[PDB]
Amino acid sequence: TKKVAIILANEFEDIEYSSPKEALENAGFNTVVIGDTANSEVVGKHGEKVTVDVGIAEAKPEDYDALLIPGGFSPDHLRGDTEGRYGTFAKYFTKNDVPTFAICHGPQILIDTDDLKGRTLTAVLNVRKDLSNAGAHVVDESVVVDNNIVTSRVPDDLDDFNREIVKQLQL
Amino acid sequence: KVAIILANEFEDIEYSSPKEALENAGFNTVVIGDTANSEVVGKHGEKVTVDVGIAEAKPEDYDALLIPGGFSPDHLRGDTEGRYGTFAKYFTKNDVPTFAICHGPQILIDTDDLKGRTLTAVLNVRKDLSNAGAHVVDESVVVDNNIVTSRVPDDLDDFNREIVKQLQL
Numbered sequence: 001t002k003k004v005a006i007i008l009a010n011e012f013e014d015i016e017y018s019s020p021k022e023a024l025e026n027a028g029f030n031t032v033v034i035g036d037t038a039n040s041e042v043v044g045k046h047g048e049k050v051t052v053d054v055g056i057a058e059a060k061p062e063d064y065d066a067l068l069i070p071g072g073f074s075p076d077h078l079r080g081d082t083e084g085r086y087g088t089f090a091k092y093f094t095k096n097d098v099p100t101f102a103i104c105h106g107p108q109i110l111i112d113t114d115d116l117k118g119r120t121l122t123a124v125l126n127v128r129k130d131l132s133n134a135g136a137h138v139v140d141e142s143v144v145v146d147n148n149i150v151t152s153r154v155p156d157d158l159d160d161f162n163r164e165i166v167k168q169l170q171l
Numbered sequence: 172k173v174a175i176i177l178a179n180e181f182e183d184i185e186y187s188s189p190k191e192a193l194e195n196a197g198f199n200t201v202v203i204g205d206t207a208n209s210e211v212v213g214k215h216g217e218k219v220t221v222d223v224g225i226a227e228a229k230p231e232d233y234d235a236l237l238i239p240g241g242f243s244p245d246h247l248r249g250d251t252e253g254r255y256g257t258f259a260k261y262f263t264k265n266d267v268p269t270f271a272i273c274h275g276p277q278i279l280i281d282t283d284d285l286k287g288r289t290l291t292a293v294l295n296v297r298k299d300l301s302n303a304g305a306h307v308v309d310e311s312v313v314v315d316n317n318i319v320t321s322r323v324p325d326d327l328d329d330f331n332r333e334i335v336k337q338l339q340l
Binding site: 073076077079080082111112124125126127129130133134 | 242245246248249251274280281293294295296298299302303304
């Protein structure tokens with residue numbers, strides 16, 4: 001059975017957690033929330049409460065078949081980790097070509113892998129310049145697939161995003 | 172007169188504290204935002220009235236630019252037209268005092284004028300500043316000619332000292 005790590009801090013955009021989670025689960029995959037502390041609670045921009053399953057210190061990235069990075073201000077919070085642990089975690093996925101799904105601000109964490117040069121991604125407008133400065137080829141499309149990396153921009157893109165992330169796990 | 176570019180979810184004290192330091196030193200501030208006479212609200216609930224809409228604002232009107240942090244700079248970088256980056260370019264291009272704290276330096280990324288400049292910021296945005304070509308350091312306040320930057324609210328005494336000193340020169 002295949003399972004997806006979702007990295008999550010406070011002030012995630014609620015629907016960018018719940019909608020991809022539901023799409024993945026509907027296709028028969030399971031999801032695990034990775035955050036600062038196991039059994040702590042993180043709260044979305046619009047109040048959705050999510051319990052963290054596994055702490056970032058304990059998580060083994062090789063256990064997971066894909067990584068999902070919801071947007072909102074959750075990725076900016078994750079990037080405040082003093083030891084940079086979420087960028088390091090994400091680096092397993094980009095280095096080993098494991099399916100990697102990020103929507104809106106989500107691709108901010110991918111900058112911290114240093115693995116973006118020459119990769120093709122989209123994101124929310126707010127972060128596109130930072131992605132381009134990280135070396136990516138940045139485009140403006142509802143969903144972009146570059147081998148293992150699937151990116152989208154905004155919550156309106158979720159239907160396209162959810163279709164592609166599920167396909168990529170079927171491989 | 173100092174332009175303050177401001178959206179919702181600014182870090183409250185990074186607006187009020189430099190504003191008061193400037194006003195104490197006898198300088199005036201003008202909040203520039205999406206629409207004149209709207210309110211933007213800080214992370215901790217502070218309400219600030221927007222003086223001038225970004226459509227009408229003329230950067231040459233101003234003696235400095237102040238960019239408070241929190242998630243205000245990220246909101247400003249969402250402007251469909253990129254108008255706040257364009258506003259900021261005037262200050263970087265013409266070497267006009269430019270003050271940014273915490274996440275505030277994110278807006279300076281959009282000027283494309285950070286190559287070889289020396290800045291600090293909150294940890295969360297340092298990689299992006301480095302990727303923009305800045306020399307990023309970890310200090311309570313950094314002065315690089317016209318650009319003054321700090322990291323977090325605790326730095327405010329130092330930040331305020333240096334931004335006031337710029338305007339006095």
